[PDB]
């Protein structure tokens, strides 16, 4: 599916009603000067989708704010809406009809938008962590992306008690197989992706019998060099290693779109080029990239642009769009 557009109502810095159309762009860059409101725009996307990484949203010189997302599910265009009242009460709607967060989560969870793992949203300043996180954390994420985290509770309950053991092996077999169903795929596609962004990278399970109970050691070796511990990589190197992991992990159950804030902040002009190349080379109707960049090197190669600017009198962010597929 595709994120066709958004509609914000007193969202953050977006006073009044704002419409954002992505058109048929499968590579859109949200550009604009510092403080104009680009990240608020991502905050709006993460908001409609659920995601908890409240009244502090709602514009401030109204009593409630809402965001709508127009998702393209096959022939039909689905409208996903979410509201916040000043008291904190949220409400979800689908095609206008109110629904529960469970029904909401599932709709999304079915289109491969796991607001649980958040593995499709890289917020400003967070890109390097995807690589630099600890093996325990990386493991936790795998457990989170595969879904193996569910059996985490029960597995713990039955784990402590010690015929009650068959109920433990039975569940262990699920947490483990579900965990591997994702890890194995990611591992197999990791090196190709890292090399394209360049090179050599790999993942390594520590507790082989119960991988979910230990770290996952991520190793990346930029080209002309030779080391492996993320400790040695530089900022730009760590960024590229991170974007590779990020893409590898998403390769299993592909989200329909990515929303990357300033992922290129620490990059070379050469590296910005490789990321842009990769994005362009892989973007398509099924994989849409929404990127927030301050670098021309990055947004030049976009299909379209969502320009954000301030209108000081009105104290609000504003939007204008441009289609670069023509120039």
């Amino acid at each position: 599916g595709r994120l066709v557009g958004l509609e914000l109502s007193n969202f953050k810095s977006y006073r009044g009603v704002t419409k954002v159309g992505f058109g048929e762009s499968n590579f859109t860059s949200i550009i604009g000067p510092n403080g104009s409101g680009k990240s608020n725009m991502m905050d709006a996307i993460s908001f409609v989708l659920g995601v908890r990484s409240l009244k502090d949203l709602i514009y401030r010189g109204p009593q409630s704010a809402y965001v709508k997302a127009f998702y393209q599910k096959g022939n039909k265009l689905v409208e996903l809406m979410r509201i916040i009242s000043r008291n904190g009460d949220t409400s979800y709607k689908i095609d206008g009809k109110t629904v529960s967060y469970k029904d909401y989560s599932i709709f999304l969870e079915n289109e491969n938008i796991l607001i649980k793992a958040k593995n499709f949203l890289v917020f400003q300043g967070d890109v390097e962590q995807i690589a630099a996180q600890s093996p325990v954390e990386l493991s936790r994420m795998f457990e989170e992306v595969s879904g193996s985290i569910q059996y985490k509770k029960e597995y713990e309950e039955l784990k402590e008690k010690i015929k009650i053991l068959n109920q433990f092996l039975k569940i262990k077999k699920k947490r483990k197989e579900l965990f591997e169903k994702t890890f194995d795929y990611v591992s197999d596609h990791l090196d190709a992706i890292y090399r394209e962004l360049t090179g050599n990278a790999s993942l390594t399970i520590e507790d082989e019998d119960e991988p979910f109970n230990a770290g996952i050691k991520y190793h990346a070796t930029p080209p002309l060099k030779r080391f492996k511990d993320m400790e040695y990589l530089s900022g730009g190197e760590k960024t590229v290693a991170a974007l590779a992991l990020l893409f590898a992990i998403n390769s299993y159950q592909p989200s329909p779109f990515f929303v990357l804030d300033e992922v290129d902040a620490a990059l070379d002009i050469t590296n910005v080029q490789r990321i842009a190349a990769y994005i362009r080379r892989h973007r398509n109707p099924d994989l849409q990239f929404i990127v927030i960049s301050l670098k021309n090197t990055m947004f030049e190669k976009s299909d379209a642009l969502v320009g954000v600017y301030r209108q000081q009198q009105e104290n609000s962010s504003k939007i204008i769009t441009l289609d670069l597929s023509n120039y």
Binding site: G21, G23, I31, G32, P33, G35, S36, N296, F299, E300, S302, A304, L305, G307, V308, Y309, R310, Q311, Q312, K318, I320, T321, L322, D323, L324, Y327
Partner: protein, 70 residues
């Protein structure tokens, strides 16, 4: 600094007319350039030197001047 070169071409044209289309301003400079100019406007609008308005999705961007442009 191109945000000045763009401010110039606009400061001129907006003294010979009330409205100015983005596509036109680009025109008077001859894709990496379209995006470059696009940012320049956004920057200028934020500083308060210019006014922006668009009617439809990817329609025309009307640029009007503000006292500060001068």
């Amino acid at each position: 600094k191109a945000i000045v070169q763009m401010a110039k071409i606009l400061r001129k044209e907006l003294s010979e007319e009330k409205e100015v289309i983005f596509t036109d301003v680009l025109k008077s400079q001859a894709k990496r350039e379209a995006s470059r100019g696009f940012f320049d406007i956004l920057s200028l609008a934020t500083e308060g030197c210019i006014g922006l308005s668009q009617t439809e999705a990817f329609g025309n961007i009307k640029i009007d001047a503000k006292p500060a442009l001068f």
